[PDB]
């Protein structure tokens, strides 16, 4: 769960998971190649926990032009729709203007989670480049 | 036809064993990785502050004194970001 | 082409710190320019390919 942790004065935020990493008896917390904390030792039970940063990314709004229409499709970049849905159901997402999802609106692009645009099995020329081979357009 | 077939059959070996070429794309990928790694490693530098951790500055000094250290960190990290973006722009010009 | 990246100044500089971002606000649009530069680079990479 995305929590704020304070292990013996080491403060951070993330999700702590059970780990297969093994520390030396004296080593307390682990750092990556770029000197970022990745593993901690629970001071009480001597368990070893891996930190993953709480999911974050960009938000891209796709409009067909305000004069043509006032609808939007929002693309949360880099995350899968399950995580966005879970965060929505726990009022966890930072932007609090959550778009309506009708079950047929959530689509999983390799770029991220696209909500508000229905997927059509046809293939047309790209109009608004979403990414990773997926484009969007205002049609019927 | 035989000459072309022989020449096209040697293209699978001469692409990697001879080195020389094919280093440009790997150079591009390695340069991007190095740039990102340096950017994210600049977060561990004090820049003259008491520490490189915002919360460590927060819980060690009073607000008026911690302002100077937090501003030193902000200036250092902004300089790092500006350097990264400028280098990216130059490299993007070369790739264009 | 080359890798298209993107950065969040608030996250990178003053991550989840309210009164670090409050002082970062005093530097103005110093970080909209970086976002625009990286967006331009990404669009240019797609154009190149």
């Amino acid at each position: 769960k995305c929590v704020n942790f304070n292990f013996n004065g080491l403060t951070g935020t993330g999700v702590l998971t059970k780990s297969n990493k093994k520390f030396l008896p004296f080593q307390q917390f682990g750092r990556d190649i770029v000197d970022t904390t990745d593993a901690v030792r629970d001071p009480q039970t001597l368990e070893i926990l891996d930190i993953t940063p709480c999911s974050f990314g960009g938000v891209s709004v796709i409009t067909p032009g305000t004069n043509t229409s006032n609808q939007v499709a929002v693309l949360y970049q880099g995350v899968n729709c399950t995580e966005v849905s879970v965060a929505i159901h726990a009022d966890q997402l930072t932007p609090t203007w959550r778009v309506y999802s009708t079950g047929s609106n959530v689509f999983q692009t390799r770029a991220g989670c696209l909500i508000g645009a229905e997927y059509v099995n046809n293939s047309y020329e790209c109009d608004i480049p979403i990414g990773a081979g997926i484009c969007a357009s205002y049609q019927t | 036809a035989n000459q072309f077939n022989s020449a096209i059959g040697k293209i699978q070996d001469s692409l990697f064993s001879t080195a020389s070429a094919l280093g440009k794309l790997q150079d591009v990928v390695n340069h991007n990785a190095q740039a990102l790694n340096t950017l994210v490693k600049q977060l561990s530098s004090k820049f003259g502050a008491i520490s490189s951790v915002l919360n460590d500055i927060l819980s060690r000094l009073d607000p008026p004194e911690a302002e100077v250290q937090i501003d030193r960190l902000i200036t250092g990290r902004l300089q790092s970001l500006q350097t990264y973006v400028t280098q990216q722009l130059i490299r993007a010009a070369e790739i264009r | 082409s080359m890798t298209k990246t993107s950065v969040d100044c608030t996250m990178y500089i003053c991550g989840d710190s309210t009164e670090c971002s409050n002082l970062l606000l005093q530097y103005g649009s110093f970080c909209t320019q970086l976002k625009r530069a990286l967006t331009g680079i990404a669009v240019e990479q797609d154009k190149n390919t």
């Binding site: 990556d32 770029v34 970022t36 940063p53 974050f56 990314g57 960009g58 970049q77 880099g78 390799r110 770029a111 790209c126 480049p129 990414g131 990773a132 081979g133 | 990928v29 390695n30 990785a33 990102l36 790694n37 950017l39 994210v40 977060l43 | 082409s1 890798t3 298209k4 990246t5 993107s6 950065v7 969040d8 100044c9 608030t10 996250m11 990178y12 991550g15 990404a42 990479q45 797609d46 390919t49």
Partner: peptide, 24 residues
């Protein structure tokens, strides 16, 4: 063949490798 932790994200190219292969 050969960061995400702090504000740095990598966007995917518009043309996947399959589309580049089709063009080639």
């Amino acid at each position: 063949t050969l960061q995400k932790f702090n504000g740095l994200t990598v966007l995917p190219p518009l043309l996947t490798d399959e589309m580049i292969a089709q063009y080639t």
